[PDB]
């Protein structure tokens with residue numbers, strides 16, 4: 001049922017409804033001569049929508065807005081990018097031109113600027129120390145500490161028990177570490193354990209790339225990260 005990388009041409013976006021007013025968005029992109037999928041989140045907030053992450057580039061993000069209008073038909077008024085990489089902020093300018101208020105932590109904004117990636121406009125305060133949580137409308141934002149990147153956020157939807165782990169969490173099909181150029185390998189498992197301790201009620205866990213699962217994706221990611229650590 002969940003849209004897979006094989007099913008989505010680059011440039012197109014699928015939505016997957018998880019619960020009343022919660023969807024993931026799934027897009028694909030060429031990377032390393034392969035095609036990889038990438039997930040974001042959409043959460044209804046009243047008669048508006050909160051978007052979590054771009055769809056990995058401007059073209060895809062335009063497709064994302066069009067698919068949202070087609071399938072849901074409510075305005076995206078805010079967006080949060082969960083780290084500074086292009087699968088999270090690539091498309092921010094598209095969102096901004098469409099009237100979306102884009103947000104990220106100051107950590108993410110600083111790193112995006114250094115990197116030459118798009119920079120969300122608004123700053124999310126209160127997330128700079130490991131273990132910090134803040135409410136943002138229908139979600140809670142949580143900074144678990146450095147993992148896939150120094151700035152990685154996770155997002156929890158309490159009404160639906162959905163934990164969006166972003167790229168700090170790997171899908172089960174990934175058995176070897178991926179892009180760790182910006183990672184903190186030493187802290188990554190500790191950061192995962194903070195997610196487990198903060199959201200032990202989570203029922204649906206979404207990795208940055210690939211198929212959702214349950215909280216077992218946390219242990220899985222720790223297993224893979226520790227194996228890479230011991231390479």
Ligand SMILES: C[C@H](CS)C(=O)N1CCC[C@@H]1C(=O)O
Pocket residue numbers: 031036085086087167177178179208209
């Ligand atoms: C551009 C993204 C940023 S997490 C990236 O590095 N990717 C996406 C899928 C493959 C590769 C990876 O994270 O291993």
Ligand code: NA
Pocket residue numbers: 133140198
């Ligand atoms: Na919390």
Ligand SMILES: [Zn+2]
Pocket residue numbers: 083085148149167
């Ligand atoms: Zn990343």
Ligand SMILES: [Zn+2]
Pocket residue numbers: 101102121122
């Ligand atoms: Zn604004």
Ligand SMILES: [Zn+2]
Pocket residue numbers: 085087167208209
């Ligand atoms: Zn990613």
